[PDB]
């Protein structure tokens with residue numbers, strides 16, 4: 001079963017949450033396969049139960065599975081590394097201090113492992129103290145290029161730039177995308193992305209020269225009555241992707 | 247194919263050299279010296295017909311695990327149709343074409359793995375490239391078009407990369423840089439060609455990598471060829487490899 005995401009035209013793959021197993025199947029079909037379906041470690045009492053249920057999801061969607069911390073929660077980073085070791089998904093969400101352990105325990109470099117780093121309000125400078133203890137200490141704020149080189153040194157695949165707050169951090173995001181393009185590194189914009197800002201946010205990464213972009217799109221496409229990601233919103237997003245990835 | 251690989255062996259999925267062979271033994275030595283991260287050019291113009299070119303190029307391919315680049319011969323557009331016919335039969339990793347030969351070559355290849363470049367040229371004007379590089383069109387008034395539009399036409403024709411030629415080394419640096427940023431933006435690949443030597447190679451490749459170009463196939467020809475033998479110097483290929491390993495990180 002494949003360990004790399006199904007990028008559309010090798011450039012863009014959606015990342016969205018599933019509300020259930022049936023929703024995961026529908027999302028996977030709506031995206032024509034060009035999606036990673038997020039399942040949260042935080043929903044299981046232990047590693048064994050999470051691994052079991054995630055392999056059930058993986059089987060429905062040809063392994064197009066993204067293992068989630070749950071809202072970037074660093075307290076889930078160890079459990080994510082353990083779950084991902086057994087599940088061998090296509091995608092893993094990590095915080096900056098959990099990238100090395102996750103890569104090492106996966107035992108291969110095909111699974112995409114992202115590394116959560118955060119806007120600071122100043123272009124070119126990012127917060128990287130995003131682990132469970134380090135997130136409680138004075139912030140570690142470093143140059144974007146150096147943060148990327150450190151993620152690469154630790155075996156990471158991509159930056160998760162979070163929380164973006166939609167377009168509120170757009171100049172910082174653009175500088176990160178330009179730095180990713182220059183280093184061969186991939187990019188996952190996350191936080192407040194929706195049907196109105198998604199095209200611009202992806203277009204900025206594309207125009208900067210980012211090789212692979214994995215946007216995450218969550219509450220803005222989720223039906224609150226069922227907790228499901230709406231398949232019609234996934235198609236709307238896939239149409240945008242086909243329009244701008246040529 | 248006969249299960250031979252149809253895509254170049256890029257080093258870390260980013261950069262693959264392209265250099266000419268002066269003989270079969272030379273092709274083997276080059277392939278060794280590059281640790282396989284090379285496409286070895288053999289030229290259609292060196293053969294009297296399609297069948298003989300196919301036969302001979304199949305022999306080269308066998309020595310080098312298909313790491314063969316079918317050449318026009320110094321981008322000569324009169325060889326364009328023969329390159330399309332040769333490439334159909336040989337199924338190499340790489341094909342050099344002029345802009346007006348990309349669609350026929352891709353169609354006769356019958357698959358999209360083999361890399362097919364399309365020759366487009368500096369104009370002196372950043373953002374604008376000459377695309378009338380086929381046998382008849384090269385003799386008419388230049389067709390000059392926006393870089394982004396030339397890339398989109400190459401994609402529409404089945405092409406994989408821009409061959410930007412003649413670069414004259416660093417002489418067209420501002421134009422080259424623009425092309426590199428436009429390829430990175432559009433997910434398209436780039437093959438800088440013309441006047442590259444061991445002293446400007448790093449800077450020329452670094453420009454493409456800093457722009458974010460996903461695959462870069464630089465061409466390095468007479469500056470590394472021993473004119474006494476016609477053979478590409480395997481030690482010059484090693485020096486190139488070492489730069490690639492330094493900068494592709």
Ligand SMILES: [Br-]
Pocket residue numbers: 068069070071072073093
């Ligand atoms: Br997460």
Ligand SMILES: [Br-]
Pocket residue numbers: 317318319320321322342
């Ligand atoms: Br040529």
Ligand SMILES: [K+]
Pocket residue numbers: 178181207208209427430456457458
């Ligand atoms: K760029």
